[PDB]
Design a protein around this ligand. Structure first.
Ligand SMILES: CC(=O)N[C@@H]1[C@@H](O[C@@H]2O[C@@H](C)[C@@H](O)[C@@H](O)[C@@H]2O)[C@H](O[C@@H]2O[C@H](CO)[C@H](O)[C@H](O)[C@H]2O)[C@@H](CO)O[C@H]1O
Ligand SMILES: CC(=O)N[C@@H]1[C@@H](O[C@@H]2O[C@@H](C)[C@@H](O)[C@@H](O)[C@@H]2O)[C@H](O[C@@H]2O[C@H](CO)[C@H](O)[C@H](O)[C@H]2O)[C@@H](CO)O[C@H]1O
Lengths: 289, 285
């Protein structure tokens, strides 16, 4: 097993198209998340809506439809092939920033003149049910046909709400089975989930993810056998080659540390490289960072 | 030993625009020389031109707005906000030449309400001097401060002009790539992208972005004049075609007459086979 020999600041967020600019732990270290993107086991099994490439992250493709009530997209995978609702919550790469309005900038796939972009404004209201294969939108432009695009920004669902990018959508319409990647639980003994943060335009400031996207593709690519209960990593300064801290990478595909009281990995340099050290017991006792 | 990514072509990103690869092709004129500044990396992992490591750094721009009596523009920085020192441009800077760019940016600092996006409309005329650290733009919005964003679409420089995404800007340059050997054609990895010219509807690049990061990551020694690759169906394990990967960081094939790699399925995986001679003759594909 290896992890990417790439400094953290050259790694991409797995939940928005952006670069990671820092690590942190959640304010409440007992907080449980259930992100659907950035999810992959160490053996290379993609979970939830997680795609392989950073350029599949938080993107949408579909064919425009129009009814008496308004317009929407009948969803496909990002390559235009049929969406696998039977096994995933939404097309691979579909955004997972819950409980907010989305603004998605799309273009028509077969394109002679004029502004080609449409901004699709999507609400996560009662009828938002991407697992069933469609979403509705409003737009100040006139999108038609096969539209492909990327999440541009997010905003509050209602005037005066806030956006909490730590939430995920409700993919179903009702008891509807949506095939969610399971929750990630802080594993105990003072360990905290490490969140990789990126700047992103959130109107009412950073989006967390649990694996850098290149870690995901690395695991898919290697299909490495898991030879222990956890993988001990060192976070190494690439210029001085000093070990800046110990981290644990778990088979289910997330990373923890023991944050120093009043601190944590948010106080570490953001240009370090994670390096696999050894397979260890689930209860390997980390030095605080 | 040298390896290439164990990832099917349709899960690989373009290295010149933020998009996925959806086919391979050869140039209409198989003698055509290109000089792309992104997607450039040697097999040993040496980045060239403006090529960044991550797919989410491809064709992005960051800088501080200046807006004066004389004009508006960006004083460019690197994508992480650190100073750009006058390489052709900051890493990741777009390399789609001879066209207007439309770049959608947000204020990194922003703590205000409202539409956070600005579309920066950029022309490749006189004030376009990214090598010197600035470009000018017009915008129907009001961007201020530290703006970070991504190339959204491109359009003709002048009314009636066409956009040719095989061109690069006038900005250090990564060197031209000349079709090598006998009968070989450079393989171009294509992505759909909003180009508002004619029927063009595509972007070529010479290395998938994940190939670039793979080489940077691996730093493998070059042990021969060229690496023979097989393009393999990952389910049946059949070899679908022979390709040659050159140390300077590009791929060739010998296309069957009237055809070529554009006829191959896009779910195949490149696999290193062996080191071969610079004049190893490929099986037509
Ligand atoms: C005059 C009109 O009907 N539209 C103007 C835009 O031009 C149209 O859309 C552009 C993208 C091209 O497809 C034109 O052929 C078409 O008429 C014009 O858009 C600007 O076009 C410039 C070319 O002269 C250039 O590409 C520029 O980047 C682009 O923004 C806009 C902006 O001036 O004005 C419309 O009225
Ligand atoms: C000045 C004004 O009335 N602007 C309206 C937009 O609302 C502003 O910008 C949004 C993003 C929020 O920051 C508001 O607090 C601010 O007044 C409005 O934007 C829409 O806001 C909705 C929330 O009520 C929701 O987030 C929606 O997704 C977003 O588009 C736009 C669109 O209705 O209209 C402007 O006039």
């Amino acid at each position: 097993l290896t992890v990417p020999n790439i400094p953290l600041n050259n790694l991409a967020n797995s939940r928005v198209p952006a670069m990671i600019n820092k690590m942190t732990v959640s304010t409440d270290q007992n907080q449980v998340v259930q992100f659907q993107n950035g999810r992959c086991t160490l053996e290379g099994q993609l979970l939830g809506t997680t795609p392989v490439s950073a350029s599949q992250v938080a993107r949408i493709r579909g064919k425009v439809f129009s009814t008496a009530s308004g317009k929407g997209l009948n969803l496909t995978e990002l390559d235009g092939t049929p969406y696998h609702a039977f096994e995933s919550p939404a097309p691979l790469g579909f955004p997972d920033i819950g409980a907010c309005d989305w603004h998605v900038s799309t273009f028509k796939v077969d394109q002679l003149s004029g502004d080609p972009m449409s901004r699709l404004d999507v609400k996560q209201n009662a009828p938002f049910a991407p697992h069933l294969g469609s979403i509705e939108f409003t737009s100040d432009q006139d999108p038609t046909g096969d539209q492909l695009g990327t999440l541009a920004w997010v905003s509050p669902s209602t005037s005066g709400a806030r956006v909490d990018p730590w939430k995920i959508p409700s993919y179903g319409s009702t008891t509807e089975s949506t095939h969610l990647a399971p929750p990630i639980f802080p594993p105990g003994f003072g360990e905290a989930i490490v969140y990789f943060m990126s700047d992103f335009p959130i109107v009412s400031a950073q989006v967390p993810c649990t694996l850098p996207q290149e870690f995901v593709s690395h695991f898919v690519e290697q299909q490495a056998p898991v030879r222990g209960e956890a993988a001990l990593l060192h976070y190494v300064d690439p210029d001085t080659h000093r070990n800046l801290g110990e981290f644990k990478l778990y088979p289910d595909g997330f990373i923890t540390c023991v944050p120093n009281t009043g601190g944590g990995p948010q106080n570490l340099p953001t240009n370090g490289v994670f390096v696999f050290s050894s397979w260890v017991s689930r209860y390997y006792q980390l030095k605080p960072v």
